[PDB]
Amino acid sequence: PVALHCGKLFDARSGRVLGPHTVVVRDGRIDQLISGLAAVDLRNRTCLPGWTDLHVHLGDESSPQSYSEGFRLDPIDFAYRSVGYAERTLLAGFTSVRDLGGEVSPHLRDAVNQGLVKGPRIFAAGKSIATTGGHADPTNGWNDQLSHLIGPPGPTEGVVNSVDEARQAVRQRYKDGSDVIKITATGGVLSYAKSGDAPQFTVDEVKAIVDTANDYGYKVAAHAHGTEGMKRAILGGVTSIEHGTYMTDEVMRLMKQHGTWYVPTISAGRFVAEKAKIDGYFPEVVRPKAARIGAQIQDTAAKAYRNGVKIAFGTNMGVGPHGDNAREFIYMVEAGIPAATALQSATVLAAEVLGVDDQGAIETGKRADIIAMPGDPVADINAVLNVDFVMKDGEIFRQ
Ligand X SMILES: C[C@@H]1Cc2c(Cl)cc(C(=O)N[C@@H](Cc3ccccc3)C(=O)O)c(O)c2C(=O)O1
343 is a site residue for ligand X (CB under 6 A): no
Among 8, 88, 98, 223, binds Zn ion (CB under 5 A): 223
Cβ(88)–Cβ(383) below 8 Å: no
Alpha-carbon span 105 to 117, nearest angstrom: 13
Alpha-carbon span 25 to 70, nearest angstrom: 45
Q: Across the beta sheet with 261-262, what order do the strands follow?
A: 181-184, 220-223, 240-241, 261-262, 310-311
Q: Which residue stretch of 45-53, 71-79, 93-101, 236-244 sits at the interface with a copy of itself (rule: CB under 8 A)?
A: 71-79
Query: With CB under 6 A, what is the number of residues at the site for ligand X?
Result: 22
Q: Is 278 buried (19+), middle (13-18) or exposed (0-12) by CB count in 10 A? A: exposed
Q: Which of residues 109-168 bind a copy of itself (CB under 8 A)?
A: 110-111, 116-117, 131-134, 137, 140-146, 149-150, 152, 154-156, 161-162, 164-165, 167-168
Q: Which of residues 282-311 bind a copy of itself (CB under 8 A)?
A: none
Give 67 or 303: the residue with its C-beta nearer to a copy of itself: 67
**Sequence-distant (≥ 6) Cβ neighbours of residue 195 within 8 angstroms:** 187
Give 212 or 347: the residue with its C-beta nearer to a copy of itself: 212
Which region holds residue 375: left if phi is over 0, alpha if psi is between -120 and 50, else beta? beta
322 is a site residue for Zn ion (CB under 5 A): no
Q: In angstroms, what is the C-alpha Rg of the chain?
A: 21
108 is a site residue for ligand X (CB under 6 A): no
Amino acid at 73: L
127 is a site residue for Zn ion (CB under 5 A): no
Per-residue string for binding with ligand X, 57-96, x by CB under 6 A?
A: x--x------------------------------------
Give 34 or 146: the residue with its C-beta nearer to a copy of itself: 146
Residues that bind Zn ion (CB under 5 A): 223, 242, 316
